[PDB]
Design a protein around this ligand. Sequence first.
Ligand SMILES: O=C(NO)c1ccc(Cl)c(NC(=O)c2ccc(Cl)cc2Cl)c1
Ligand SMILES: [K+]
Ligand SMILES: [K+]
Ligand SMILES: [Zn+2]
Length: 399
Amino acid sequence: SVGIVYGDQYRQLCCSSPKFGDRYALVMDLINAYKLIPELSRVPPLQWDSPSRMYEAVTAFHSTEYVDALKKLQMLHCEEKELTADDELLMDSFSLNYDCPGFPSVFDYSLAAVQGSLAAASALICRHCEVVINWGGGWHHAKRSEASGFCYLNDIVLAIHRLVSSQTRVLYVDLDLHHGDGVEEAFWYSPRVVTFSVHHASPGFFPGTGTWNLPIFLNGAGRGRFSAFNLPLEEGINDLDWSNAIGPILDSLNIVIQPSYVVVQCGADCLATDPHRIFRLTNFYPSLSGYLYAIKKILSWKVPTLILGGGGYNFPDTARLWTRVTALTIEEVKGKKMTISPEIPEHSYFSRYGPDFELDIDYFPHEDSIQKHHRRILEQLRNYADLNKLIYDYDQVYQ
Ligand SMILES: O=C(NO)c1ccc(Cl)c(NC(=O)c2ccc(Cl)cc2Cl)c1
Ligand SMILES: [K+]
Ligand SMILES: [K+]
Ligand SMILES: [Zn+2]
């Protein structure tokens, strides 16, 4: 079946942060208004049988002291009195500040996404589901002992760790506007988790990595050398050029790596209507949405797949994209056509889709360095396959 993570408590927690507000509710209610929920298997978030089992799961990646600080940060924000100087210094040492502030549910909110993405991995491992979707997950910037970019716990790293410990190889594909630095870093020394991020990069733009470092690309270390891939792209790119840029790379990686699982981060901040206003992708499904192109290509491999959310700050347009991604996944896996009306159906958040209440985002598209990146990346894939002694047809890949 196609699984999707949700639950009443889960929806409550995913909607409790100051930055992302009720985004997750809009996403799931649009999926519901288009009658997709009966097509999907509900995957409940993982719960644990003691505080010690919870800690053992989260500290598979994160340090115990970081977990301790994040839980203390929640407690402190549930009392009225403000922080002492010693507690502020403690939070500062884990970057629990500025872009990653505390709030009354910050720990349960962060943990919830971990619970969802670990349950999604389990449902793929036991073969209940061929694909699982978690639009509450995808928080790719969090590091072992540091919050970053409103990511407090790295649900993706923990999901991938569960997958690889079930020889298992995982291909991680990161479609967010931003470089997936936290996932890349976690698996920097690990050849069995190959990471590939396509993103904007330019001087001063967050988080800064995934690009030239004459400078060269770093790409892993130890036995993980050549196992971290990156494609940085200039601002203004449209669906067609983004699709051609990443399409051959995706197919080459699948052919050479032959992954046991694929994990996709599908942050929606590349949409032309995101307030970042950097890339110009759409949710269009005839100009074909770069996101839908990539997901369809990945699903055509027939490899068990985890699809996660991520960035996306125009909440109705994020709903519009992820609803179409969800219908596409049903069609590709079940072989059953999903027809989606071009008009938004009546439902509790209908008023949020004004002023025109259509499923297409409201955008009118327009519009050699990529050739050089393609040559560089193919060379790296050759180095990866040589180092790891893999068998593959150069002429099929070079094709
Ligand atoms: O999504 C992210 N990473 O995956 C991510 C990480 C760090 C930052 Cl600073 C941001 N940026 C924002 O939050 C933001 C920027 C401009 C505007 Cl107009 C509105 C917002 Cl909401 C996003
Ligand atoms: K990315
Ligand atoms: K790696
Ligand atoms: Zn982002």
